Structure formats: C-alpha cells, structure tokens
Amino acid sequence: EVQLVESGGGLIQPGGSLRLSCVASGLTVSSNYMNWVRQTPGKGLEWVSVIYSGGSTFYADSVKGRFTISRDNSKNTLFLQMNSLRAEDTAVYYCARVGGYCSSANCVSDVWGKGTTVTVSSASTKGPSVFPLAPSSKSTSGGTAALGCLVKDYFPEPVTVSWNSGALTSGVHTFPAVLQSSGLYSLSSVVTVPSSSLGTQTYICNVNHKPSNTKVDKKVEPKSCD
Amino acid sequence: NLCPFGEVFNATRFASVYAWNRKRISNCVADYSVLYNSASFSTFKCYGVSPTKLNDLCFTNVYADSFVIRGDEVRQIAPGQTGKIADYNYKLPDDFTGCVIAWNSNNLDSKVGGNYNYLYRLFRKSNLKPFERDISTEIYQAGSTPCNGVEGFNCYFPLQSYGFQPTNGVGYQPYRVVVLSFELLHAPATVCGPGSH
Amino acid sequence: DIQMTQSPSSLSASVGDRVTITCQASQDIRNYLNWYQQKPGKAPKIMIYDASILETGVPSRFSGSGSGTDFTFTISSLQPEDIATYYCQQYDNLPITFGQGTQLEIKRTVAAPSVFIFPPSDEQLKSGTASVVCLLNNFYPREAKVQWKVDNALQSGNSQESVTEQDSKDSTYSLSSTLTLSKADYEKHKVYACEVTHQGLSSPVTKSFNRGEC
Ligand SMILES: *[C@@H]1O[C@H](CO[C@@H]2O[C@@H](C)[C@@H](O)[C@@H](O)[C@@H]2O)[C@@H](O[C@@H]2O[C@H](CO)[C@@H](O)[C@H](O)[C@H]2NC(C)=O)[C@H](O)[C@H]1NC(C)=O
C-alpha cells in the first residue's frame, strides 16, 4: 500500500497565500512524478502541477505564476505554495502519483491522497446554529418516527454530525450542505426511529465545526404543549 | 576528403534517444550547402552560429549527434529546455553554439502493429548533464524497498518503448533529430569549410 | 492541450445490465489513458490502467478497450457496489486532462416517498428566523416536485432543496426542502404545507400544519 496524507486546506481571503503539504508513506516523493490536482465540485478534476524526480516542475495555465510546487526529501513531503489566490481556486486538492506506462509485466502504481478543501472567499468564519427538528404526529407514520437536527448559518465547510456520539447509526441521513442566499451554508441531519422509542430512548445529535471551534450537543425531544 | 555528413543523415538506421549516437567530425572539409539545400527538413534551428557564415569558418572538432524522438518532443531539443527527453535522455548546454535539424520519419521508422525498437528513459534520479549519455538498465527504485534487480512494486524498468505506428497522430510520429556542435578549442582547427584560405 | 469528451454525463441502468462509457481525445494519445472511479465523498481510485489493464482487486466484470482517440469503459454485469462517478484521464501530455464525468444510477422498482414536515422550533423563532423543513425519505426515482403552499399560495424563492446520494443498499434517495422566512413573515400566515408530486404517488401528497397548534 501507499498512503498520501494531506493538510493545509482552509479559508483564505482573496490574494492571500497558503502552503499545502502532503506526506507520503511507502513512496519516495523525490523519486517519482508527483502531481497536484484540484477538483471543483462543479467543473470536475483539473491538473494543477507536476514535479519530476530530477527537479523539473510544470504548472497549468490557470496556475502559472501564482503556485509553486516543491518537496523536502528529509521529511519526504510534497509542498504546493499558492499565492494571489483567486475565488476560482476554491477546490479540493489531491497529491498523487499518476500510474501508467505499463510494460507487459509491471505498471506504475497509481496512488491518490485524501484531499484538503481550499476555500477562497471574503466572508468571515461563522459558527453554526443547531435547532431541533422535533418528532410529532406529522413526523410519525407507519410506526416509524422521524426527527433530526438543523445546522444553519455556518461558514466555511465542513461540518461533522453524529447521533448519540456514534451509537445511533442506522437510518441516519445527513444531507449535503447547500449555500444559502446569505452566503452561509446550511444542512439537516435526520434519523428515523421507532414510534415507541420516543419516550424511553434519548436522542442527541453532536455537531462539530472545527473551522470555528463549535461543539454542540443538542437533545431533540418530541413536541410539547406548554 | 569531405566530411561524412551524409553518413549520419541518410543512415538507414538510427539510435534510440537514450543511447544517442555521436560521430566525431575531424580532419576533413565540410559542405554545409548540402545541409541547407535539402528543403525536406521540418525543423532547422541554429543557435549561435550563423548558417551562411558557417561555410567560411574552421573549427577544432564537430560533433553530429543522431537519435529519434516524438514530434511533440522536438521542442525539447533546444538550449534551456525541460522535460523527459531534455533531462533523462539528451541535454543541450545553455551556452549551445550549433544547429538542431529534425525531420519527420514516419515513412521509415514506423511499423504497423508497433515499432518497439526505439526506447527512451522514463525514470532517473538526477538530471542529465549536457551531452551526457545514460544507457543503464538498472531497475529504478521508486520507493524505500530495495529492488535487487527484480522488477515489481516501486521497482520500474527505466526504459519506456515508443509505440511508433504509421497511423499515429503527428505528435506521436517518429522524428529523426541531428544535432551539430562546433567545438573550437585551443588546438589546430582541422574541420574547415568550403571558403577557407 | 488535449480536450477529453466523456459520454454520457449520466446514465441509469438496472442491476446486472451492461454499462458502456465512451471517451474521446482531441488528438492521438496512443494507449496512455486511465479510468478512475470516485465514490461519493472519497478520492478517485484507479480502475483501468492504459485503456485495458485492470487494477488488482477490481472484479472481472469491469473491462476496458480502445486505442488512439477513442476508448470505452464497460461493466458487464452492474452491481450496486459500483455507483460512483467515473472519469477518463490522459497523461503523457501536459496538461493532464480528465473527462467531464459519468454518474451511475441503479434502476429499481418505483418507491413512494415518506413525507414528513417539521415546523420551526421555538429556539429558532426566538432568534428571528423560521425554517420549515419538508422531508422525503426512501424513494425512487430521484425526480420529485416539492411545492410550498402558504394559505393556498405557491411560495417560490424561499425554498431550498438538498438530495442525498443514492444509498448503496436500498438504491433510494432522500430529499429535504427548507423554507426560510423572517419572524414577521412567519407570523403573517397561518397554514404552511409542502405538496409532493412523485411517480410513486397516485396523486400529490400534502403535509400541512397550522401556526401555533392545529
Ligand atoms: C541525403 O539524400 C540525398 C542523397 O543523394 C543520393 O545520391 C546518390 C548517391 C544515390 O545513390 C542515392 O543514395 C541518393 O539519391 C541528397 O540529396 C540530393 O538527392 C538527389 C536525389 O534524391 C541527388 O541527385 C543529389 O545529388 C543529392 N544532393 C547531394 C548529394 O548533394 C542529400 O544531400 C543527402 N544528404 C547529405 C547530408 O548528403
């Protein structure tokens, strides 16, 4: 196996800089063709930069003059410096060794990393607001009740959601975030439970937003008539 | 006695770029008009030397390097260029004083089904110094595990084969390249041109 | 540069069916073409080396063919463990180019959606915003119309829909429609409803609620 662990993605204002790092395991970055490739959700995969084992570097036209690829053989890490970042550079960046050049017996192993999200915007970091999607008669049908948590008004991405601290797993649907008109992301995490479990079992959703250091543990209780 | 320029140009067989051939022109008179009059050259670029004035000059030695590459790689045979060929196969000095002549050879070096006799180097630790030739077939260690001559994971054969076929695109068709380097040392110039006193 | 064209951009096929994806390069790339499979959320995984070579671990149902400027990626018998986005990539010519992508959807029996509705919580109303959440769960096909009726008046612009990925087991989808209003706008009306039109329903289903309590 070959592992490519990446880091350095985060929110950065237009014009700022950012250095993405990619540590390798089971692969010498100074002896391979190491590639940086970004993927915008709307456009798809896009090659960014490549570095040869001998030291030669090449960059894409949308990237030339602004980015710079490099490496440290002692740390065995591939670096991508990004300057004068524009809003179009917002994507998930991967480090990889593009496989191919196959002989009859052996090929070059194609190994991709995990990816880091680089967001470029002028909006400041905001934390999420967690509200309870409460179970009720309108949410009960066929002996199965539906509850959940509404994570609203957060920036940037991502946000991790669990239920009962990883205990409740089956029937959990966490919708992908949508960018609201106010420029803030918002999503919902629903879960279907038995209608009888509304009284005994306690349901708590755990929302974590690392970009803002926000940790919320909201207890979703059924609707009440006060 | 004339210099054997036709010996390297109209040769029936050429060498792979990683094992490029070199003919040491010495003790002869040249006829550079025969090189210019041939209008079948698709690429003819001289760096430093003046082609017309080259006729009325003398040099200590001349070197004619010959090899075959791809079409889209002919641009790499130039002073101050980077790529697979310029770094791991054939490197020109940044102070190059000579000429690069490349012509398409799809009707000579291409075979239906694939002409896998021409090879190039894919993996190499350090770049090639100018006018260096590396013909080693040592298994390239791409990782931290030793190879011990056996090919496998992270252990690649450093030579890739050109798939030269007559139906390839222009960029992947074979091109024959001849590089002329005029060396003028502190020694009796023994390679003079037509108009030398 | 080399422009890569992948067709189709999205295709739906049942289990066990034969899936074929074509890829065309703007110029000759010989056999230097890879095929990648990217699961939802994961990173692109190598699926086919050099047009035809099959990566170790990939089942024998996968196959690849073609050379020059035309290539094809084929799945003989489709299984639900294969739903992903597939790309064709050319190297050996910089810049390395990819395809636009091909979504894979597993056809199944039409399933009616389970419709729920969630009124805005009191904790959110105390902040000055009201978000009504209509929820459709476990349905196929993915296409479904969701309209908002506020006192028998179609509300547009406030709604915002989000669909989850196709489940790797049920091959079903889930949709959430959030309608956001201000505190005064939410107090302006009494009845809030979401009307769902879907193939699995013989008629549109409406989930409604009155402000305060019914
Ligand atoms: C490489 O190509 C031709 C070789 O000319 C040869 O002439 C005879 C020896 C015959 O046996 C064949 O090998 C060739 O035709 C040179 O170009 C001219 O070619 C025409 C015919 O094609 C010939 O009549 C001319 O004499 C040739 N001109 C010369 C010899 O100056 C060409 O110059 C050769 N290249 C070099 C560097 O010599």
XYZ file of C-alpha atoms and ligand atoms in Angstrom:
675
model
C 0.000 0.000 0.000
C 0.902 3.686 -0.338
C -0.510 6.424 1.897
C -0.672 10.118 0.963
C -1.869 12.232 3.909
C -2.540 15.865 3.016
C -3.011 19.024 5.072
C -3.175 22.787 4.632
C -6.704 23.365 3.303
C -8.729 26.140 4.879
C -10.381 29.513 4.454
C -8.186 32.208 2.898
C -9.101 35.682 1.669
C -8.560 36.597 -2.000
C -4.930 37.496 -2.607
C -3.619 35.598 0.412
C -1.295 32.617 0.391
C -1.439 29.022 1.595
C 1.002 26.083 1.611
C -0.474 22.611 1.111
C 1.565 19.709 2.482
C 1.379 16.041 1.513
C 3.317 13.424 3.487
C 3.992 10.067 1.833
C 4.262 6.552 3.259
C 5.617 3.704 1.162
C 6.653 6.067 -1.644
C 9.670 8.323 -2.198
C 8.459 11.715 -3.420
C 11.967 12.588 -4.646
C 11.935 9.528 -6.948
C 8.503 9.842 -8.592
C 6.380 12.132 -10.749
C 4.316 13.842 -8.043
C 1.165 15.664 -9.164
C -1.155 18.194 -7.552
C -4.726 18.011 -8.879
C -7.690 20.098 -7.710
C -11.361 19.183 -8.142
C -14.054 21.832 -8.140
C -17.479 20.270 -7.429
C -18.956 21.994 -10.470
C -16.190 21.566 -13.037
C -14.514 18.277 -12.130
C -10.928 17.101 -11.960
C -8.243 19.556 -13.074
C -4.488 19.010 -13.211
C -2.564 21.730 -11.355
C 1.164 20.993 -11.086
C 3.731 18.224 -11.533
C 7.311 17.791 -10.323
C 9.820 15.339 -11.778
C 12.328 13.248 -9.855
C 15.131 15.322 -11.395
C 13.661 18.625 -10.189
C 11.700 19.826 -13.229
C 8.358 21.484 -12.461
C 5.363 22.314 -14.660
C 2.163 24.216 -13.875
C -1.188 24.711 -15.580
C -2.058 27.986 -17.298
C -4.705 28.895 -14.706
C -1.973 28.306 -12.108
C 1.349 29.510 -13.609
C 2.959 32.490 -11.895
C 0.850 32.022 -8.744
C 1.543 28.490 -7.479
C 4.854 26.733 -6.860
C 5.484 23.019 -6.317
C 8.422 21.762 -4.255
C 9.476 18.936 -1.959
C 11.571 18.067 1.091
C 13.388 14.741 0.823
C 14.315 14.638 4.521
C 10.655 14.978 5.524
C 9.526 13.064 2.391
C 6.780 15.628 1.813
C 5.389 17.345 -1.286
C 4.530 21.042 -0.970
C 2.339 23.344 -3.064
C 2.647 27.057 -2.324
C -0.327 29.111 -3.530
C -0.043 32.889 -3.889
C -2.520 35.525 -5.090
C -5.331 33.020 -4.582
C -8.482 33.822 -6.548
C -12.019 32.648 -5.861
C -11.757 30.217 -8.789
C -9.008 28.288 -6.967
C -11.631 27.032 -4.484
C -11.447 23.239 -4.789
C -10.379 20.016 -3.096
C -6.682 19.434 -3.797
C -5.056 16.000 -4.047
C -1.471 14.798 -4.278
C -0.948 11.702 -6.388
C 1.459 9.617 -8.447
C -0.298 9.154 -11.786
C 0.064 5.498 -12.711
C 0.534 4.047 -16.158
C 3.431 3.469 -18.570
C 2.682 -0.239 -18.306
C 5.049 -2.904 -19.571
C 3.875 -6.482 -20.123
C 4.740 -7.431 -16.532
C 4.678 -4.321 -14.323
C 2.947 -0.939 -14.066
C 3.479 2.260 -12.089
C 1.128 2.177 -9.110
C -1.471 4.957 -9.213
C -2.000 6.258 -5.667
C -4.106 9.284 -4.709
C -4.300 11.094 -1.391
C -7.270 12.026 0.766
C -7.627 15.684 -0.218
C -7.850 19.069 1.508
C -10.520 21.699 0.885
C -9.152 25.147 -0.003
C -11.872 27.812 0.172
C -11.256 31.345 -1.120
C -13.846 33.930 -0.085
C -14.183 37.284 1.659
C -16.838 36.089 4.123
C -15.573 35.689 7.674
C -15.741 32.419 9.587
C -19.095 31.891 11.306
C -20.265 29.117 13.595
C -23.404 27.034 13.099
C -26.749 27.262 14.869
C -28.288 23.912 15.831
C -32.083 23.663 16.038
C -34.195 20.559 16.750
C -36.390 19.033 14.044
C -38.771 17.642 16.631
C -40.731 14.389 16.256
C -44.515 14.663 16.261
C -47.663 13.205 14.721
C -46.730 14.875 11.430
C -43.328 13.153 11.665
C -44.723 9.739 12.684
C -46.051 7.346 10.043
C -46.201 3.565 9.798
C -44.851 3.098 13.314
C -41.630 4.930 12.381
C -40.892 8.430 13.672
C -38.617 10.993 12.022
C -36.505 13.504 13.962
C -33.289 15.380 13.319
C -31.160 18.480 13.754
C -30.999 21.589 11.559
C -27.481 23.011 11.237
C -27.886 26.553 9.920
C -25.741 29.568 9.019
C -22.168 28.302 9.055
C -19.050 29.097 7.026
C -16.878 27.619 5.764
C -17.179 23.851 5.240
C -17.270 21.135 6.507
C -19.465 20.148 9.463
C -19.473 16.695 11.070
C -22.687 15.320 12.582
C -23.185 12.219 14.733
C -26.049 10.831 16.811
C -25.693 9.661 20.427
C -21.915 10.075 19.985
C -21.692 7.408 17.291
C -24.140 4.994 18.935
C -27.135 5.574 16.649
C -26.043 4.803 13.082
C -28.801 3.022 11.146
C -31.375 5.159 9.372
C -29.315 8.359 9.627
C -29.451 10.628 6.562
C -27.146 13.665 6.702
C -27.940 15.848 3.703
C -25.143 17.655 1.839
C -24.748 21.324 2.664
C -26.343 23.944 0.417
C -25.084 27.518 0.121
C -27.923 29.817 1.157
C -28.607 33.191 -0.442
C -26.991 34.854 2.600
C -23.656 33.241 1.697
C -23.807 30.792 4.625
C -24.052 27.015 4.389
C -26.929 25.066 5.920
C -27.845 21.386 6.151
C -30.035 18.921 8.033
C -29.353 15.528 9.615
C -32.481 13.405 10.046
C -32.941 9.957 11.572
C -35.865 7.519 11.588
C -36.638 5.762 14.879
C -39.460 3.565 16.217
C -42.510 5.461 17.434
C -42.378 3.680 20.805
C -38.765 4.769 21.400
C -39.823 8.427 21.696
C -40.347 8.089 25.453
C -37.580 5.806 26.700
C -34.681 6.400 24.307
C -32.920 9.773 24.416
C -31.728 11.139 21.063
C -28.890 13.685 20.984
C -27.119 14.989 17.878
C -23.454 16.013 18.064
C -22.441 18.782 15.645
C -18.781 19.757 15.260
C -17.461 22.698 13.214
C -13.670 22.756 13.508
C -13.099 25.973 11.459
C -14.924 27.888 14.228
C -14.292 25.633 17.270
C -18.014 24.957 17.694
C -19.132 21.802 19.515
C -22.884 21.444 20.063
C -24.742 18.556 21.723
C -28.456 19.182 21.143
C -31.137 16.931 22.639
C -34.058 16.519 20.227
C -37.163 15.996 22.353
C -40.676 15.409 20.979
C -43.046 18.338 20.611
C -44.745 19.599 23.771
C -47.826 21.694 24.552
C -46.850 24.189 27.250
C 38.319 14.353 -48.317
C 34.811 15.562 -47.477
C 33.267 15.274 -44.034
C 30.846 12.310 -43.696
C 27.706 14.381 -43.194
C 25.660 12.011 -45.350
C 26.850 9.090 -43.219
C 24.767 10.273 -40.247
C 21.906 11.966 -42.105
C 20.943 9.395 -44.759
C 21.732 6.459 -42.462
C 19.268 3.596 -42.817
C 19.004 3.020 -39.051
C 19.003 5.471 -36.145
C 19.620 5.054 -32.423
C 17.237 5.465 -29.513
C 17.341 8.837 -27.777
C 18.724 7.391 -24.535
C 21.585 5.763 -26.470
C 22.101 8.605 -28.941
C 24.919 8.158 -31.445
C 27.769 10.631 -31.874
C 30.036 10.997 -34.905
C 33.246 12.936 -34.246
C 33.894 15.012 -37.368
C 37.633 15.698 -37.544
C 40.263 16.156 -40.275
C 38.010 16.883 -43.244
C 36.400 19.704 -45.222
C 32.656 20.309 -44.993
C 29.992 21.357 -47.500
C 27.291 22.933 -45.317
C 25.490 23.941 -48.528
C 24.346 20.319 -48.832
C 22.653 20.625 -45.434
C 20.813 23.855 -46.269
C 19.777 22.947 -49.827
C 17.753 19.994 -48.504
C 14.275 21.500 -48.100
C 12.793 18.308 -46.603
C 13.659 19.418 -43.048
C 10.592 20.308 -40.982
C 12.759 21.809 -38.210
C 16.028 23.673 -38.797
C 17.145 25.991 -35.981
C 20.705 27.199 -35.353
C 21.764 28.717 -32.024
C 24.823 30.961 -32.009
C 26.403 30.041 -35.334
C 25.411 31.916 -38.479
C 24.442 29.365 -41.169
C 25.842 31.313 -44.127
C 28.980 32.432 -42.288
C 29.401 28.852 -41.033
C 30.653 27.962 -44.526
C 33.704 30.248 -44.291
C 34.945 29.057 -40.911
C 37.175 26.459 -39.268
C 36.731 24.502 -36.039
C 38.771 22.186 -33.842
C 36.118 19.447 -33.895
C 32.487 18.945 -34.888
C 30.036 16.500 -33.315
C 26.958 15.057 -35.039
C 24.504 13.509 -32.575
C 21.650 11.428 -34.004
C 18.535 9.955 -32.381
C 14.776 9.527 -32.802
C 12.046 11.036 -30.616
C 8.381 12.032 -30.865
C 7.002 15.030 -32.724
C 5.670 16.915 -29.697
C 9.090 16.399 -28.048
C 11.203 18.076 -30.757
C 10.795 21.384 -28.906
C 12.788 19.897 -26.010
C 15.925 19.609 -28.173
C 16.792 23.265 -27.565
C 19.125 25.184 -25.228
C 17.469 25.758 -21.873
C 14.603 23.276 -22.143
C 12.979 20.923 -19.649
C 11.081 17.665 -19.963
C 11.556 13.915 -20.094
C 13.917 13.943 -23.081
C 15.935 17.041 -22.176
C 16.566 15.805 -18.615
C 16.827 11.996 -18.812
C 17.903 11.338 -22.418
C 19.731 14.170 -24.205
C 20.624 17.556 -22.702
C 21.939 20.587 -24.613
C 24.125 23.175 -22.860
C 22.634 26.562 -22.059
C 25.556 28.123 -23.986
C 24.954 25.911 -27.023
C 26.619 27.015 -30.276
C 25.373 24.803 -33.103
C 22.310 23.626 -35.031
C 19.370 21.286 -34.422
C 17.882 19.610 -37.508
C 14.761 17.461 -37.140
C 12.653 15.843 -39.858
C 9.641 13.544 -39.795
C 10.422 9.868 -40.368
C 7.049 8.128 -40.172
C 7.674 6.525 -43.581
C 10.957 4.971 -42.384
C 10.885 4.213 -38.644
C 7.203 3.254 -38.235
C 5.773 -0.265 -38.410
C 2.169 -1.442 -38.415
C 1.441 -3.072 -35.076
C 4.178 -1.042 -33.394
C 7.917 -0.477 -33.839
C 9.159 -1.174 -30.305
C 12.884 -0.903 -31.089
C 13.163 2.803 -30.234
C 13.257 3.452 -26.484
C 13.566 6.394 -24.111
C 14.369 6.805 -20.425
C 11.423 7.457 -18.098
C 12.862 7.303 -14.561
C 16.165 8.794 -13.412
C 17.337 10.215 -10.085
C 19.238 13.331 -11.184
C 19.000 15.242 -14.444
C 21.474 14.629 -17.258
C 24.484 16.900 -17.541
C 24.936 18.448 -21.008
C 25.969 15.858 -23.616
C 25.640 13.008 -21.106
C 24.535 9.526 -22.171
C 22.987 7.096 -19.676
C 22.328 3.637 -21.126
C 21.921 1.808 -17.806
C 19.152 -0.780 -17.447
C 19.206 -0.883 -13.639
C 15.765 -1.362 -12.100
C 14.657 2.040 -10.815
C 13.812 2.081 -7.099
C 10.746 4.316 -6.782
C 10.249 3.681 -3.052
C 12.174 2.764 0.078
C 12.284 -1.011 -0.534
C 15.335 -2.323 -2.435
C 14.724 -3.975 -5.802
C 17.742 -6.314 -6.161
C 17.394 -6.427 -9.947
C 13.840 -7.813 -9.761
C 11.042 -5.721 -11.263
C 7.878 -5.197 -9.242
C 6.074 -2.751 -6.971
C 8.005 0.542 -6.758
C 10.664 -1.144 -8.937
C 10.286 0.000 -12.542
C 12.289 -0.658 -15.686
C 13.674 2.805 -16.546
C 13.231 2.449 -20.335
C 9.841 3.023 -21.967
C 9.139 1.961 -25.551
C 7.826 4.246 -28.281
C 4.742 2.792 -29.940
C 5.695 4.010 -33.409
C 2.918 3.161 -35.877
C 2.183 4.733 -39.281
C -1.368 5.572 -38.127
C -0.317 7.634 -35.093
C -1.014 11.321 -34.711
C 1.590 13.843 -35.798
C 2.665 14.437 -32.196
C 3.368 10.726 -31.654
C 5.028 10.052 -35.022
C 8.786 9.366 -35.039
C 11.125 12.262 -35.805
C 14.823 11.914 -36.621
C 16.989 14.586 -34.983
C 20.592 15.522 -35.804
C 22.443 17.965 -33.533
C 25.637 19.621 -34.791
C 28.007 21.006 -32.140
C 31.026 23.035 -33.283
C 33.827 22.799 -30.709
C 36.600 25.400 -31.063
C 39.353 24.613 -28.561
C 42.907 25.962 -28.276
C 44.113 23.456 -30.859
C 44.751 23.320 -34.630
C 41.344 23.719 -36.287
C 41.089 20.645 -38.525
C 37.470 20.962 -39.747
C 37.320 23.852 -42.214
C 34.541 24.870 -44.567
C 34.463 25.427 -48.329
C 35.705 29.023 -48.264
C 38.825 28.724 -46.102
C 42.158 30.221 -47.162
C -3.942 20.868 -24.997
C -5.964 17.650 -25.304
C -9.706 18.028 -24.758
C -11.323 14.889 -23.330
C -15.006 14.227 -24.057
C -16.794 11.619 -21.935
C -20.231 10.261 -22.837
C -22.699 10.117 -21.390
C -22.525 12.582 -18.492
C -25.053 10.446 -16.580
C -26.691 7.074 -17.158
C -29.183 4.911 -15.267
C -29.138 1.122 -15.561
C -30.621 -1.778 -13.629
C -28.667 -4.398 -11.700
C -26.900 -6.914 -13.920
C -27.126 -4.713 -17.018
C -24.237 -3.905 -19.351
C -22.868 -0.371 -18.895
C -20.694 1.278 -21.557
C -18.930 4.650 -21.287
C -17.128 6.195 -24.264
C -14.230 8.655 -24.114
C -12.676 10.635 -26.972
C -9.410 12.578 -27.029
C -8.984 15.683 -29.171
C -5.803 14.148 -30.622
C -3.863 10.891 -30.560
C -2.872 9.758 -27.063
C -1.933 6.163 -28.055
C -2.866 3.896 -25.096
C -1.837 6.362 -22.348
C -5.315 6.584 -20.834
C -6.510 5.730 -17.324
C -10.027 5.212 -15.971
C -10.862 6.368 -12.443
C -13.783 5.573 -10.138
C -14.664 8.140 -7.458
C -17.080 7.046 -4.743
C -19.293 9.741 -3.155
C -17.034 11.651 -0.767
C -13.942 9.504 -1.341
C -10.944 10.189 -3.589
C -10.614 8.967 -7.193
C -9.472 5.342 -7.261
C -7.581 3.889 -10.218
C -9.752 1.409 -12.108
C -8.178 0.763 -15.537
C -4.509 1.172 -16.461
C -3.560 2.042 -20.048
C -7.005 1.560 -21.616
C -7.095 -2.209 -20.969
C -5.014 -3.207 -17.917
C -7.226 -3.970 -14.910
C -6.071 -2.835 -11.470
C -5.548 -5.636 -8.959
C -8.646 -6.133 -6.823
C -11.060 -4.852 -9.482
C -13.658 -7.535 -10.340
C -13.571 -9.289 -13.702
C -16.906 -7.706 -14.685
C -15.015 -4.476 -15.399
C -13.289 -4.155 -18.760
C -11.617 -1.510 -20.891
C -10.913 -1.250 -24.606
C -9.844 1.184 -27.297
C -6.765 2.991 -28.588
C -5.742 6.159 -30.377
C -8.527 8.712 -29.975
C -11.499 6.505 -28.987
C -11.857 4.427 -25.813
C -14.606 2.558 -23.963
C -15.089 1.523 -20.324
C -17.501 -1.384 -19.882
C -19.187 -3.081 -16.919
C -20.588 -6.456 -17.976
C -22.948 -7.056 -15.030
C -23.765 -3.995 -12.942
C -23.879 -4.355 -9.157
C -24.963 -1.726 -6.599
C -21.410 -1.603 -5.195
C -20.391 0.300 -8.352
C -22.447 3.514 -8.073
C -19.933 6.362 -8.416
C -18.604 8.986 -10.823
C -16.260 7.622 -13.491
C -13.574 9.661 -15.256
C -11.236 9.067 -18.192
C -7.796 10.664 -17.883
C -4.946 11.115 -20.351
C -1.346 11.551 -19.228
C 1.997 11.617 -21.145
C 0.872 15.034 -22.497
C 0.781 18.037 -20.216
C -1.585 19.389 -19.032
C -3.064 16.096 -17.830
C -6.724 16.192 -18.842
C -9.757 14.389 -17.430
C -13.289 13.785 -18.626
C -16.402 15.647 -17.564
C -17.605 12.616 -15.604
C -20.313 9.948 -15.711
C -22.773 9.424 -12.864
C -24.003 5.864 -12.316
C -27.554 5.278 -11.061
C -29.075 1.891 -10.226
C -32.609 1.465 -11.540
C -35.081 -0.216 -9.204
C -38.794 -0.508 -8.531
C -40.575 2.815 -8.103
C -40.840 3.679 -4.406
C -43.245 6.231 -2.969
C -41.606 8.845 -0.709
C -42.329 9.041 3.012
C -43.276 12.691 3.544
C -42.714 14.442 6.871
C -42.809 18.106 7.874
C -41.054 19.976 10.693
C -42.294 23.384 11.888
C -39.713 25.907 13.121
C -38.540 25.322 16.669
C -39.203 27.825 19.440
C -35.444 28.192 19.931
C -35.153 29.384 16.325
C -38.219 31.645 16.475
C -36.621 33.432 19.440
C -33.724 34.320 17.102
C -35.872 35.966 14.417
C -35.966 33.254 11.729
C -38.395 30.432 10.921
C -37.332 27.411 8.853
C -39.940 24.830 7.843
C -38.354 21.551 6.734
C -40.189 19.169 4.406
C -38.630 15.703 4.267
C -38.998 12.960 1.648
C -37.362 9.656 2.556
C -36.543 6.422 0.714
C -37.926 6.933 -2.778
C -37.099 6.184 -6.418
C -36.744 7.668 -8.972
C -34.809 10.747 -7.859
C -37.032 13.236 -9.702
C -39.707 14.675 -7.408
C -41.546 18.006 -7.355
C -41.915 19.784 -3.999
C -44.050 22.937 -3.833
C -44.801 25.106 -0.799
C -48.402 26.152 -0.115
C -48.804 29.029 2.352
C -52.548 29.684 2.747
C -53.097 28.139 -0.708
C -50.405 30.295 -2.326
C -47.369 28.871 -4.113
C -44.215 30.216 -2.447
C -41.087 30.471 -4.603
C -37.619 31.803 -3.813
C -37.628 30.872 -0.127
C -37.368 27.118 -0.705
C -34.009 25.358 -0.973
C -33.733 21.643 -1.731
C -30.974 19.136 -0.997
C -30.811 15.476 -2.042
C -28.554 12.852 -0.501
C -26.555 10.366 -2.545
C -28.138 7.124 -3.705
C -27.985 4.535 -0.937
C -25.575 1.691 -1.675
C -28.184 -0.807 -0.393
C -31.777 0.367 -0.958
C -30.787 2.327 -4.096
C -33.143 5.035 -2.810
C -32.866 8.787 -2.283
C -33.797 11.315 0.388
C -34.693 14.972 -0.144
C -35.015 17.901 2.264
C -36.687 21.198 1.340
C -36.035 24.085 3.736
C -38.250 27.181 3.551
C -36.797 30.157 5.431
C -38.779 33.229 6.499
C -38.377 36.052 8.985
C -40.226 36.266 12.295
C -42.714 38.817 10.954
C -43.155 36.934 7.670
C -43.800 33.707 9.584
C -46.427 35.454 11.733
C -48.131 36.848 8.610
C -49.674 33.457 7.775
C -51.394 30.516 9.456
C -51.198 27.360 7.302
C -47.886 26.010 5.978
C -47.718 22.955 3.731
C -45.412 21.148 1.317
C -47.026 19.336 -1.615
C -45.017 16.438 -3.060
C -45.561 15.201 -6.618
C -43.820 11.914 -7.398
C -44.184 8.948 -9.734
C -44.786 6.507 -6.869
C -47.783 8.580 -5.722
C -51.131 8.337 -7.498
C -51.718 11.994 -6.549
C -49.764 14.810 -4.867
C -49.468 14.367 -1.098
C -49.695 17.450 1.133
C -48.275 17.676 4.663
C -49.645 20.763 6.405
C -49.676 22.395 9.828
C -51.219 25.482 11.394
C -49.180 28.119 13.181
C -49.369 27.720 16.933
C -51.306 24.464 17.165
C -53.972 22.951 14.906
C 20.707 12.629 -48.394
O 19.798 12.452 -49.559
C 20.288 12.684 -50.897
C 21.155 11.502 -51.274
O 21.517 11.548 -52.647
C 21.910 10.305 -53.077
O 22.625 10.324 -54.268
C 23.091 9.045 -54.774
C 24.398 8.730 -54.049
C 22.045 7.884 -54.711
O 22.733 6.646 -54.645
C 21.063 7.990 -53.508
O 21.682 7.386 -52.373
C 20.672 9.436 -53.189
O 19.744 9.935 -54.147
C 20.997 14.033 -51.043
O 20.225 14.880 -51.888
C 20.171 15.000 -53.257
O 19.385 13.887 -53.711
C 19.257 13.805 -55.138
C 18.334 12.643 -55.428
O 17.465 12.384 -54.334
C 20.635 13.645 -55.771
O 20.504 13.633 -57.189
C 21.544 14.789 -55.343
O 22.860 14.582 -55.842
C 21.588 14.896 -53.821
N 22.398 16.031 -53.414
C 23.646 15.918 -52.944
C 24.191 14.523 -52.846
O 24.305 16.897 -52.614
C 21.206 14.692 -49.688
O 22.105 15.788 -49.808
C 21.769 13.673 -48.717
N 22.251 14.323 -47.510
C 23.547 14.542 -47.269
C 23.868 15.225 -45.973
O 24.422 14.205 -48.060
